[PDB]
């Protein structure tokens, strides 16, 4: 197959780290990305905790437990099948926000528990301390006095909002310590560094209640991820040249280079000006690493 | 472009009515039941209908500013990106839940960055998808007062569907079309009903387990990723129906034939699809007659 990117305007696609529309892109004004969601090669090989559907982003699933005066969740994949530690740092879709407080909303998910009554709850999960061990299959839940009815029950959890850990700032580039003190989590997606030639990594942004820093950056729109998995197009050069074009006239508004590892770069600040957010990325051709933006 | 469907296993795709993985297929109990879902609606050549969006990130969500008029609380709706809802193209803002005549239990957060510097931005609220006060087509819905809304009055929030329950006195009917409201002479903008094909065929529904309490299985007529695929491709529709095979991802054995119609739904001839494994991949075989015999 010939390589391509989605022919969908940027502002109709989802962030890959939270399920929110993209409302911008930017280079970092400071900070190394090693996100575990939104990670895929250009030839369609998923990495980290990344999966296909935006319906999976920043969610968890598992059975709530209570032991030794502490609550937690025994994790599974979002479809209810078991999580195998060999395959990934955590179950697919697991939030990749580290060293912070994850404020989750959850619902019972067993049909037999969904015939009557309110199946919903909320809970805080720290993405820190040794009891945060999703690679080992478990995470601690903060006791809010409203978890007892859910002990022994299977639930699905979604990330509602995020706040800083007491004594620390909220760092959206922090990598969660998935393997606790036991091991480095298997199959972590690697850190990304810019290649040179004045180039800077591009982040796609969404406004989201990461309180104190409500702009979540990711390295690929989720629909790019599913596109590459669908296509499995062979990588045929150092970089894929993209033009970001006017959605109606197809005039080029700016050039980008996508690298095989699954991220893109630009040379920013080429006269003050602002790119619109409703443009469309179009694959032009494979180009050498020396292509100058 | 030549026509195609996603080369993704069914169980990795999302329902189009709730953001949940598909975990089954079914045919309706009454094979003459007419679905008129407003999400997951698209033609085979990529024209969106109803409240259908490209991204699964929009499914069953709302956005707007909370108000309090004399003790009556509500939301003045906008599109999910915060731009105004103009009602040009859809019966409600894109992504709006299409569950009718029931109680929508929403979780919400303030979404203005200036309101996201400190503190807990979150809340929850019930919204009835019934009565004249449920009028998303006219840009407003009533919120049930839970005594915890006042801090949010005048604030912009985004809402998401956490769970659903039946309206007192009624069953939870997941085939019900919400009454989105009428605006004088303006078109409803509703995606059309899909009438059962008959003659042995039955509409295929993709299902997800979800907390629609008392009926925890949500049916839809297309996986969400089919929608974005068709929008992306804009492939001319060259026949009156598309023949698909549902294939084992390993053996590549054909597990069953399906017909996809230009209006954006699928049928089969049950002998039903509920018994098929859920990890198969749909593959476009050929354009066929509207009358092609499965
Ligand atoms: C006010 C209240 O607590 N009512 C309880 C019933 O729950 C309500 O039932 C309504 C339909 O008759 C409607 O679905 C409401 O949304 C629902 O209220 C929700 O659920 C309850 C448990 C509370 O958490 C509320 O705060 C919430 O808004 C309840 O009915 C039973 O559960 C509901 C979910 C539904 O499945 C219904 O069919 C069940 O009979 C009954 C019985 O447990 O108790 C209260 O009356
Ligand atoms: C227990 C409590 O109410 N604490 C308040 C602070 O909120 C907590 O702050 C923690 C970091 O120091 C951490 O982020 C917690 O998650 C957070 O608690 C959450 O938010 C509060 C408001 C409550 O709703 C809790 O139930 C919830 O778990 C609070 O800190 C300020 O807000 C938080 C969210 C964070 O942005 C922080 O940087 C802010 O200073 C302070 C100040 O208002 O008041 C309490 O101590």
Numbering used by the authors:
A (entry chain A): 230 to 259, 262 to 501, 504 to 526
B (entry chain B): 230 to 500, 504 to 526
The authors write:
NoV VP1 has two principle domains, the shell (S) and the protruding (P) domains, linked by a short, flexible hinge. The S domain builds the interior shell that forms the basic structure of the icosahedral capsid, while the P domain dimerizes constituting the arch-like protrusions extending from the shell. BV, a clinical isolate, bound uniquely to the Le, but not the A and H antigens, making the BV distinct from other tested GI NoVs that bind generally the A and H antigens.
In this study, the crystal structures of the BV P dimers in complex with the type 1 Leb and the type 2 Ley antigens, respectively, were resolved. The BV P dimers in complex with type 1 Leb and type 2 Ley tetrasaccharides, respectively, were crystallized in the same space group and unit cell dimension of native protein and thus may be viewed as isomorphous with the native crystal. The β-Gal of the precursor makes a major contact with the “bottom” of the binding interface, which is stabilized by residue T397, while the Le epitope, the α-1,3/4 Fuc (Le Fuc), contacts with another part of the “bottom” and is stabilized by the other “wall” (S346′, T347′, G348′ and D349′) to support the binding outcomes. In fact, BV does not form a single H bond with the H epitope in binding to the type 2 Ley antigen, while only one water mediated H epitope between D349′ of the P-loop and the H epitope was seen in BV binding to the type 1 Leb antigen. Finally, BV also forms a water mediated H bond with the N-acetyl glucosamine (GlcNAc) of the precursor through T347′ of the P-loop in binding to the Leb antigen, a scenario that has not yet been observed in the other three GI NoVs.
